[PDB]
Design a protein around this ligand. Structure first.
Ligand SMILES: Nc1ncnc2c1ncn2[C@@H]1O[C@H](COP(=O)(O)OP(=O)(O)O)[C@@H](O)[C@H]1O
Ligand SMILES: Nc1ncnc2c1ncn2[C@@H]1O[C@H](COP(=O)(O)OP(=O)(O)O)[C@@H](O)[C@H]1O
Ligand SMILES: [Mg+2]
Ligand SMILES: [Mg+2]
Lengths: 116, 52, 535, 526
């Protein structure tokens, strides 16, 4: 097992990426983190989203480059590995999104990426 | 002339005194462990770890 | 009079009719009407202090602690946490007025409250509420006919926008942007006129993008005949400014093609691996060359792309931006005159949009960048970029400019205006008063009460401006009766004259008609209700 | 009647409502409390604050910055929220003036409370304040002086502005050294406004005077194992490629064979692909290689055998800064060596700063990116030094953008207030009283500046007012001894943009808060 345990705060969700090479983690401070299983280095930490993240979803058709994160900011915001930026965000949710399902993705309100 | 500024607010003086008191307390706490005749301290963490 | 009924039978046996009837409340008859009238009066009296140029603001705090300082009545009532059902009816009435017109969301509540306040003393004298509602409907019909009679027409030509500017200024005069009043009116009028189906058809607000960023000043708010995006050039080393850009809009990520169906590509030999690697490299090179062959100077995607495509775009002098949203893609395509191409193989020169200037804009010591597309040929989309000293005034400016755009849209739909400042209400009250003198006396009380309720707007305007309400209203009414001039209103700004024609206080006739109609129907419903059965 | 004071209750449980008296009272109390809290940290003799977090981390920080003080406080008063947002937006627009704008808004709202007590309608106050703001802005613009033509005069103005900005912070101990530091750092940007190109490294230990601006660049990354640790006349190649189990982006591809010999052959083919990638990179003729992403063991040993120093995991900011300082191009394909330019520097080596090892780029080609090393006795000292440098660099960059300068030390406030008083003296009605209160708040600003120093604020303010009314338009407070003097001679200058923004934002927020006559709260979730 990886059992890395490099984390100052607790882990709301530790979602293993679809690519069998790296893991995606989000701490209790609302910042997501990407770790390489082989090397162990933290590739990049995602700022913003001040309240703690609560769900992590990678892209379903492999494509280990984009993911969506939601937490207590009542936000549904999408990232990108190749730039480390919030490429897309949503505002419909208003209460501490618990779990998110990737279809577009349904979170608890079905969002569509092609039309925002 | 005579009297200068009144300095109505008393909080800054209290803050300075409290800061100095805390620093002096820390210095007095660790004074006993100074020099070749100084002696060690045993510190027990909340988790139960013990360090001398 | 409350809790329902409690009998437990005349034989002592249990008498249960409705589930949980012991913990359910009930109001019957006239007391329910009085409670509803009192609640509506409270709501209207809360609203009336934010009416007119001298009206004050309400500072709304939601459940999360976010603060919204605003003057829009519809916004205030929407953000107001009420529990009384009649208050919810008032909130829905304000929302209805906002949806139908966009302006006058505060006048409707005051008018309905005045109508119900008069209906209270009418009910106290033993008149059936249905008769009061019928009299109110008759008086509302008379007032609407009088408004149509005294209405005046304005020209909605693009060559002469002065009446439109004056109407927008009148709309904005009660908001916090009255410091930038004329500039705000100018940009609202130009934004509406730039994007509008000229043959008196609809105005599509989807093509008016209102964006606000903190910093700067209110005077820095400007109308941009293009699209403002919250993105930037993907590679940090591409130029920040492109002139005479030939824009290529794409919705295909600059990645190797991927079938939608579940697909597995089998590699069974070293030659297969080499062929796949060469296929990847050639796909990247071919897509970049296809983009370049059309002669485009700037490429816009929607789904982002990877490092190889980014460096190829930089290497070939092709500035590009990625992850542009769908609505922003549509706006860019509309403004630049270019089509949206779903894949590189369909990208031709004729599908390229054109922009006179594409620039990246900094915002001081904030690291944030925004893309600007403007100087198009015949751009059919506009962007209003609002700057301010804090987010709260930015939101207020957003809703104020929305009010101005809605008013100009109403002018587009119908070009008949009525002079405001209480002149319209006073003239309608006078018309109702003359009509009531000929009516049989039984509906006369309802019609006179309707006239008195209509007279509340000039009183509220006078009281907000510090003038004595009754004296000012009586003087203005006497002047209107003496000299036939339905343009005399309340001098809220103390300009020295009571004539709103020279003061250029202009209101759309459609707005006043909608106000009167909606208030009358809501009052009719509230009068028709006689029971409440809350749990 | 009233929404709350009615026989029938129209609200949910927990919802509240405050009418004119209560709304104005709460707004004024919140604004005045915020202004009093943030003040006393104003002027050269201002003091710092301790911000103790109540959370699990219990983060500790000492600061003189108004924006950071207002950010990290639990605020329930909505008007206080308005002022906090004002301070944050002021910080975003320009680096300084966060405390001044908040104090000005608080004083304006206090004067508004007095005027309301004097039975003056708030609309009249707002109109008078709009007129006063227009007059004060016109006067301040007319007083502005531009030195952007002469290079020596502009450099002197930049030095004075940096010194004035740093005078109120903890860096005032070594103001001269830190002023030289900030001016050199900003001038090295070659006109660009990119403040992210200046990297501040905080290393514990040493004195605060040990801080310095590196003549080249410093990177906090590591070198590979077998790669050289020292390169002279480096040929930099900055990349953003994979170099880590680099897989074909055809994610539907898989290896499906009938024997392990074919699997071994495919593995050798993958290794050969990586070797060919490294050979293509090396064909550029380079001595150093910086990749944004990770570099795995096989490319690491290939670079080591090639005798090329390869730096891995230099983040987006890192590769951008290296591109800015060395002139290289961030590449991702290496099929065209002649179309990619390479960064260059005289020497790269490893240096020790405290107990950590960093990579040093010396004799850089362009140098449009700076690394400032901060040495301090405590973490709080390092954080405050970083914040003070941020303020100084932001103000210097704004002055580079717009070279117009105005005199500080209360001179601009006195001039604007004198103009406002002149306007009010010729205006009839209560608007004159409103403008007089506006000018009174403008006076109160340097009054607080002098009070923080323990001086005789009343006498100094009276002398400044008399001098400005006489015609001495450059008179200002002299905090060295506590008299008045010529700000032009004494060299207290400020960015015209900063004071204009402070005045306009303060007036705007005061008008926004004053317009409120009712506060309605929804039921909180808790
Ligand atoms: N310059 C003015 N002079 C007199 N009355 C005005 C003036 N500007 C606006 N009003 C009046 O103020 C009233 C309120 O308008 P406003 O507050 O902008 O929107 P709402 O009608 O939703 O309250 C309008 O009925 C209008 O007649
Ligand atoms: N050397 C100086 N002499 C006189 N006044 C000064 C000097 N340095 C700074 N000030 C004044 O101190 C005021 C407060 O600046 P400061 O406390 O650094 O942050 P802020 O500008 O955000 O309030 C400025 O308005 C400036 O006029
Ligand atoms: Mg209106
Ligand atoms: Mg300062």
């Amino acid at each position: 097992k990886k059992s890395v345990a490099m984390h100052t705060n607790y882990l709301s969700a530790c979602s293993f990426t679809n690519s069998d090479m790296q893991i995606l983690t989000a701490s209790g401070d609302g910042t997501c983190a990407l770790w390489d299983v082989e090397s162990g280095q933290l590739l990049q930490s995602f700022h913003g989203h001040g309240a703690d993240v609560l769900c992590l979803d990678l892209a379903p058709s492999e494509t280990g480059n984009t993911f969506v994160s939601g937490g207590c900011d009542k936000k549904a915001m999408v990232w990108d590995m190749r730039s480390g930026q919030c490429v897309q965000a949503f505002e419909t949710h208003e209460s501490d999104i618990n779990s998110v399902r990737y279809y577009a993705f349904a979170s608890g309100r079905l969002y569509d990426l092609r039309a925002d | 002339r005579g009297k200068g500024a009144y300095q109505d607010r008393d909080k800054p003086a209290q803050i300075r005194f409290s800061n100095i008191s805390a620093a002096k307390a820390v210095a007095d706490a660790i004074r006993t462990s100074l020099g070749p005749k100084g002696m060690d301290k045993m510190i027990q963490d909340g988790k139960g770890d013990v360090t001398i | 009079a409350s809790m329902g009924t409690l009998a437990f039978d005349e034989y002592g046996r249990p008498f249960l009719i409705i589930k949980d009837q012991d913990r359910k409340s009930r109001l019957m008859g006239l007391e329910a009407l009085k409670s509803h009238i009192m609640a509506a009066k409270a709501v209207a009296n809360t609203m009336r202090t934010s009416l007119g140029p001298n009206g004050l603001d309400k500072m709304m705090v939601d459940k999360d602690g976010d603060v919204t300082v605003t003057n829009d009545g519809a916004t205030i009532l929407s953000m107001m946490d009420v529990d009384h059902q009649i208050a919810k009816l008032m909130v829905e009435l304000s929302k209805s007025q906002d949806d139908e017109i966009g302006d006058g969301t505060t006048g409707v509540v005051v008018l309905a409250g005045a109508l119900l306040e008069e209906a209270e003393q009418l009910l106290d004298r033993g008149i059936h509420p249905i008769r009061i509602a019928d009299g109110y409907e008759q008086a509302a019909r008379v007032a609407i006919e009088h408004l149509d009679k005294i209405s005046d027409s304005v020209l909605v030509d693009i060559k002469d926008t002065e009446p439109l500017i004056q109407t927008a200024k009148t709309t904005l005069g009660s908001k916090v942007v009255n410091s930038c009043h004329r500039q705000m009116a100018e940009i609202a009028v130009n934004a509406v006129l730039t994007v509008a189906d000229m043959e008196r058809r609809d105005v599509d607000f989807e093509l008016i993008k209102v964006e606000g960023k903190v910093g700067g000043r209110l005077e820095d708010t400007k109308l941009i005949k293009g699209v403002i995006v919250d993105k930037d050039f993907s590679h940090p080393q591409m130029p920040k400014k492109v002139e005479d850009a030939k824009i290529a809009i794409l919705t295909c990520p600059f990645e190797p093609p991927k079938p939608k169906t579940k697909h597995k590509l089998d590699v069974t030999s070293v030659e297969d691996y080499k062929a796949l690697q060469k296929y990847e490299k050639e796909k990247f090179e071919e897509m970049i060359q296809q983009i370049k062959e059309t002669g485009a100077n700037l490429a816009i995607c929607q789904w982002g792309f990877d490092d190889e495509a980014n460096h190829l775009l930089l290497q070939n002098n092709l500035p590009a931006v990625r992850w542009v949203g769908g609505p922003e893609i549509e706006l860019i395509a509309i403004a630049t005159g270019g089509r949206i191409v779903p894949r590189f193989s369909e990208l031709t020169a004729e599908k390229l949009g054109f922009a006179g200037l594409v620039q990246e804009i900094s915002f001081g010591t904030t690291k944030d960048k925004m893309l600007v597309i403007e100087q198009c040929k015949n751009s059919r989309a506009v962007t209003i970029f609002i700057r301010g000293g804090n987010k709260m005034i930015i939101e207020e400016a957003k809703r104020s400019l929305h009010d101005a755009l809605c008013v100009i849209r109403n002018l587009i739909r119908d070009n008949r205006v009525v002079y405001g400042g209480g002149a319209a209400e006073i003239s309608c009250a006078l018309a109702v008063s003359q009509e009531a003198d000929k009516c049989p006396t039984l509906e006369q009380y309802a019609m006179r009460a309707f006239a008195d309720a209509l007279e509340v707007i000039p009183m509220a305007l006078s009281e907000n401006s510090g003038m004595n309400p009754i004296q000012t209203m009586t003087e203005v009414r006497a002047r209107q009766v003496k000299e036939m001039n339905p343009a005399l209103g309340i001098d809220c700004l103390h300009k020295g004259t009571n004539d709103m024609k020279q003061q250029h206080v202009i209101e759309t006739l459609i707005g006043k008609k909608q106000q009167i109609s909606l208030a009358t129907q809501m009052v009719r419903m509230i009068l028709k209700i006689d029971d409440i059965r809350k749990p | 009647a009233s929404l709350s004071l009615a026989p029938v209750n129209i609200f949910k449980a927990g919802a509240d409502e405050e009418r004119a008296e209560t709304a104005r009272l709460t707004s004024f109390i919140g604004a005045i409390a915020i202004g009093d809290l943030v003040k006393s940290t104003l002027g050269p003799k201002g003091m710092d604050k301790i911000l103790l977090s109540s959370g699990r981390d219990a983060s500790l920080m000492v600061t003189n910055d108004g924006a950071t003080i207002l950010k990290n406080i639990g605020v329930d008063n909505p008007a206080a929220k308005v002022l906090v947002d004002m301070s944050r937006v002021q910080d975003d627009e320009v680096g300084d003036g966060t405390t001044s704008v908040t104090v000005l808004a608080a004083e304006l709202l206090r004067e508004a409370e007095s005027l309301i007590a004097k039975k003056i309608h708030p609309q009249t106050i707002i109109a008078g304040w709009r007129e006063a703001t227009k007059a004060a802005r016109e006067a301040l613009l007319s007083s502005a002086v531009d030195h952007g033509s002469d290079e020596v005069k502009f450099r002197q103005d930049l030095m004075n502005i940096a010194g004035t900005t740093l005078s109120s912070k903890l860096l005032t101990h070594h103001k001269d050294h830190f002023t030289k530091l900030a001016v050199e750092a900003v001038l090295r940007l070659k006109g660009s406004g990119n403040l992210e190109a200046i990297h501040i490294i905080k290393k514990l230990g040493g004195s605060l005077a040990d801080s310095y601006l590196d003549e080249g660049f410093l990177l906090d990354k590591k070198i590979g194992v077998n790669q050289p640790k020292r390169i002279e006349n480096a040929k930099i190649l900055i990349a953003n490629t994979g170099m880590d189990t680099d897989k074909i982006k055809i994610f539907g591809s898989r290896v499906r064979v009938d024997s392990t010999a074919k699997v071994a052959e495919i593995e050798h083919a993958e290794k050969e692909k990586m070797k060919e990638k490294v050979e293509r990179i090396l064909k550029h003729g380079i001595n150093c290689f910086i990749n944004r992403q990770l570099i795995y063991n096989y490319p690491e040993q290939l670079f080591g055998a090639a005798g090329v120093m390869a730096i891995e995991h230099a983040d987006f900011a890192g590769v951008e800064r290296l591109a800015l300082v060395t002139g290289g191009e961030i590449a991702s394909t290496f099929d065209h060596p002649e179309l990619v330019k390479l960064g260059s520097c005289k020497l790269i080596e490893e240096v020790m700063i405290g107990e950590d090892k960093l990579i040093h780029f010396s004799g850089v080609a362009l140098g449009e990116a700076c690394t400032i090393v901060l040495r301090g006795a405590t973490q709080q000292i390092l954080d405050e030094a970083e914040r003070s440098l941020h303020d100084a660099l932001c103000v210097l960059a704004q002055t580079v953008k717009d070279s117009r300068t105005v005199y500080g030390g209360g001179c601009s406030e006195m001039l604007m207030a004198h103009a406002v008083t002149q306007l009010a003296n010729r205006t009839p009605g209560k608007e004159a009283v409103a403008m007089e209160s506006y000018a009174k708040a403008l006076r109160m600003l340097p009054t607080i500046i002098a009070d923080n120093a323990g001086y005789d604020s009343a006498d100094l303010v009276a002398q400044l007012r008399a001098a400005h009314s006489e015609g001495n338009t450059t008179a200002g407070l002299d905090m060295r001894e506590g008299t008045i003097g010529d700000m032009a001679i004494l060299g207290i200058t400020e960015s015209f943009q900063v004071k204009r923004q402070v005045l306009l934002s303060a007036a705007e927020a005061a008008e926004v808060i004053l317009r409120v006559d009712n506060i309605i709260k929804a039921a909180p979730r808790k």
